[PDB]
Amino acid sequence: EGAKPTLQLVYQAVQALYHDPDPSGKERASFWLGELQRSVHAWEISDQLLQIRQDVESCYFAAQTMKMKIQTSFYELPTDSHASLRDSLLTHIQNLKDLSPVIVTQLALAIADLALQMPSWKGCVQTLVEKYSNDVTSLPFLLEILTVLPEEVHSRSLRIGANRRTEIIEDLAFYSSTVVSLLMTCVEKAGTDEKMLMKVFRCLGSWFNLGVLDSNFMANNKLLALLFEVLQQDKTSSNLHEAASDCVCSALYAIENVETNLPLAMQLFQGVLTLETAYHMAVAREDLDKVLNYCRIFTELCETFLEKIVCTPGQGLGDLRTLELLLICAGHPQYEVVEISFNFWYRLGEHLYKTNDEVIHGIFKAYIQRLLHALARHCQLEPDHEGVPEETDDFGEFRMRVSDLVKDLIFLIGSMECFAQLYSTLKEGNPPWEVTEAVLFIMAAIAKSVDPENNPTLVEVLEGVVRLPETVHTAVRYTSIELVGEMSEVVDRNPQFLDPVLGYLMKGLCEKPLASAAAKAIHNICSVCRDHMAQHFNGLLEIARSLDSFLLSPEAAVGLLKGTALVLARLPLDKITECLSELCSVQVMALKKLLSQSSDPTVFLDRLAVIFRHTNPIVENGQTHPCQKVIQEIWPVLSETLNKHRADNRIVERCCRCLRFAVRCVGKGSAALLQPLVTQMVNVYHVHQHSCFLYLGSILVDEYGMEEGCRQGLLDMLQALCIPTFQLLEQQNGLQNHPDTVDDLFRLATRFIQRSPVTLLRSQVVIPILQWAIASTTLDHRDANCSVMRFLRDLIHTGVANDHEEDFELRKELIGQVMNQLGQQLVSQLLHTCCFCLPPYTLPDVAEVLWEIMQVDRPTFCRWLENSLKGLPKETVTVTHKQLTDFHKQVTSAEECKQVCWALRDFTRLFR
């Protein structure tokens, strides 16, 4: 025998899962039931719970458990028992077909997943239909099985091979005639049952999505006529409407090429056009369910025929009546309707942009302005709105979505023509405030893209904005400020408007809800007009000093400092270093105050960061850098602040971020900070392993790696930082638990291998780094994997790069040692992670590493790759001999790195 859980124990656990008075008692039962599902005991327990049929809770748990075991643990079943499990599942769904629909889907999903993994069940669709089609009570669950079976063909949670999946799809296509014939019988029998038609529609759309239905046979098929028949009738409920809408969208989306499926395309095209009457009927009854459904059908129709709309507009399947349907939907007062079609308008603009033909553009010009006219009305705030427009709720994100869409479609109208059009509608009619606000919002979207040569109509709009009194609505003042920020180029070309614009932005800067928008606009004027801004610099510094007392958001304050730093860099070298110590002291003194106290230096660290980041003056003739002097004044308080909050990863992160831009700004200068910073970095990293010290070290190596006097100190820093790093990675699941450490470690190693490779390759710490690099390729992490692959790529490239250099033969020899001891292991680990461990996003990075290995020694790579292919688990025909052979041929006989990537895509696809 053996220890097994008993039926009484699981029934008591299932009851406790739903009905335990102690709320912690049901999470205690949930944990144990989860342990049961992942155990070998779950097979028999689920079967017996489904045979007893005690209640809905126990039967649902058993059905879900059966599904999970079949899709995750099918190897636990002996092949001898596959047929017994199928018969049991078919028996269970028969007995429980009326107990609960949610139980039936789980059993249907189990039957589907079982068939997909049981090739001995040949023609399962045929056996299922000619066993249950004659019983009207068995049709509901028969359709459920036939609905979820195509869905599970591409289930990520199943991991069937690409070769097996091709067998499945062409076997399901062979029986597509019988499932279509079953659906026609399902509408002849009980065709008035609304629930029956929904099951017929969901099954039809599922087989459309799989792409196995006959196009010409479905074109002349009554199922498609019934589909549009119910979408015309007003009496159809919301459930049947959604089922029919999804199926029409599935049929339209199933047409990937309009000429191959021309008879079907014409039938669908004619069908949706007849739904316009039903659309207006749905709008009159305020049935927002159907309205959104029709807009999805309309949007998908234009998506399916987007090629014909652009190629032959106004003729045949390019008939512009399709766009007229979308413009009708754009007229609906609810903005949730028009935003359904926003993706199509992007594609239309993208395709119209490709065809560099202004004659084709002119065909659609009217349709875009007609759409833009509707989008401007949707952006209108309510007439009783209080303050500035929201930018974080549903209506705020919609306005930002419209702003991006108008920027991408404005070329079809002409930015200059559309800008003056919106501005002319503002003078006449005495518009309400919410209308003037929305029109100003659209104008701000296209202001950056209008040619600033036609000054008259442009410079007079800017002139009218600064003359706005404070009596105007807050939202109108808010949007007008952002418009000025977008018109920074018209100010640079007409410099006489600088003072009126700066003055107007000053007033909004001194108001609370306009402070952020005014700081953003001031920043835009600073970066664009930084030439003739030396006069207004003194005023900017005054704002930079008393910056903290302005009710500015952290982003607005940083952006305001960025603008002041840009105009400062254009000043003479004397005035730069003079004003820089002042602007930093107001942040330095505040940092000293925090050392005598909540005390959160994040704000003042970020303010020092943005100052160093954008203070890049033209230093020539061997002059001293103005920021170097300020770095030595700033260093002690930074080191003091860093040592206090050394345990807080967030504050340390902002400290190193400020130190990053400080070193970047000065460059090889400020070498005095090398010894005290590196010393503090190693000491703090010994107790608290913040990965940002590895990144900060990479900046030092990137900035001082080429100077021979620093290569030893940097190598000592690397050997020092690697001791606590390896202990962090040697822990169980250390790679998965510390991915940021893996990321920043090979950022440091990459900067080392490209600034001083001979120093690293001839050291002792390069051996553990190489071993961790090969081990880190298994880590499923976007930033970590990109950093590791980049290191391996540049490490191997060292034996090829700069063949003109004096030390080329030494690098070639040093890389040959790495190739001999680790070359075969690297190719095998790279092939292993691509097929089993990593998602497809890593393939271009892996391909670049494989490409570099072929550059160093191509014939030896052919041998290493042939070995890794032979010793590869060719099982999920998982990998045929021709597929192994073609892969080795495509990689080794590749002339570009792209060919290695394409070979990885095809080969790696076989394992998922």
Partner: peptide, 9 residues
Amino acid sequence: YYRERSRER
């Protein structure tokens, strides 16, 4: 969110 790195080259 507070962690910021430099982009690729």
